[PDB]
């Protein structure tokens with residue numbers, strides 16, 4: 001049952017790593033695309 | 049077109065990688081992923097009716113939807129690989145050999161701590 | 173009637189604006205004399221043909237990609253379990269939800285087509301395979317529950333399946349659990 005506990009621990013840590021990795025990927029995707037688009041939109045009217 | 053999709057995608061991510069216990073078998077997240085995936089498809093069809101239907105370019109919003117779909121679909125497979133890793137405890141009793149030192153060092157950085165039962169087993 | 177053709181062909185394209193969904197492969201013109209029952213003399217007709225080819229990227233992305241991803245994910249859910257020695261949950265609800273979504277997609281796509289009965293399009297064969305895999309996959313998942321239920325109903329153990337099951341076991345990367353090995357030794 002100790003072997004089961006050790007593999008439970010590995011899965012618990014791994015899914016915690018997945019939570020952090022997929023949270024940053026979401027933030028950079030949603031924010032990055034819209035911020036880039038706003039930058040293109042802002043330079044058009046204001047300068048060109 | 050963007051705000052409703054981001055909120056659903058963010059909420060579903062938390063559901064993929066959250067559990068109520070450390071030493072219990074996990075439930076499959078396939079149903080959660082399928083329901084989220086099927087809703088975004090309806091959103092895509094609805095938005096697609098407002099556009100020229102050209103093939104020359106890929107809009108900025110198309111890239112946003114592609115990333116949301118990829119995160120949900122790839123996130124569903126990542127959640128299933130967590131169940132795969134936990135299932136290795138039952139199949140034979142080869143314990144983790146070198147993963148256990150790496151797992152212990154990463155454990156404090158990602159704010160997760162060992163359960164009491166695991167600590168008791170180590171002392172035993 | 174006689175036709176007057178241009179440098180590039182029967183129909184001029186020097187001022188043509190390209191279409192975002194179609195390509196003009198070429199043009200043709202034919203002059204033919206025809207008799208009709210209403211008149212004793214012939215008529216002269218000019219036939220202009222335009223050959224246009226669709227640009228597929230838009231339709232492949234919007235009609236095929238979303239369905240393939242959902243079908244692939246659902247397949248994994250059908251034949252995946254968290255344990256070997258525990259009763260499985262029925263996958264009928266998973267199959268029904270996937271099946272009902274594909275029906276909506278079929279209705280949505282069907283509104284974009286002539287509604288003819290002459291032919292079966294290429295995309296129709298793609299959808300038929302996706303439906304068959306999900307529907308047949310649902311029955312295959314239920315047959316796994318049927319086989320596991322044979323352990324409780326009486327205790328006739330597997331007779332010749334056990335040697336076949338052990339040889340196939342390594343090729344499909346699955347290994348025996350510890351309890352089964354302990355039971356065998358006991």
Ligand SMILES: C[C@](C#N)(COc1cc(C#N)ccc1C(F)(F)F)NC(=O)c1ccc(SC(F)(F)F)cc1
Nearest residue numbers: 095096099100101102105107110113117233237238
């Ligand atoms: C909403 C829509 C947009 N934009 C409309 O389509 C287009 C419209 C115009 C115009 N004008 C130009 C190109 C496209 C396309 F189709 F090239 F994007 N389509 C999507 O957003 C999308 C995203 C991913 C997937 S494929 C998945 F599996 F979901 F990842 C399918 C559709």
Ligand SMILES: C[C@](C#N)(COc1cc(C#N)ccc1C(F)(F)F)NC(=O)c1ccc(SC(F)(F)F)cc1
Nearest residue numbers: 281282285286287288291292293295296299300303
């Ligand atoms: C989307 C649509 C297409 N293409 C439209 O229909 C047609 C349209 C044209 C034209 N022009 C010619 C033939 C057909 C049809 F109807 F012959 F396909 N239909 C499907 O894709 C489909 C597939 C399987 C099933 S039956 C299931 F149980 F789902 F397997 C039902 C509909």
Ligand SMILES: *[C@@H]1O[C@H](CO)[C@@H](O[C@@H]2O[C@H](CO)[C@@H](O)[C@H](O)[C@H]2NC(C)=O)[C@H](O)[C@H]1NC(C)=O
Nearest residue numbers: 203204205206207208211212213214215216217
């Ligand atoms: C009116 O139209 C008819 C359509 O059949 C023409 O018939 C052709 O006649 C020529 C001989 O003059 C044949 O070599 C062709 O084979 C016929 N057509 C076909 C399709 O075989 C007819 O010539 C036209 N002019 C008339 C009747 O004065």
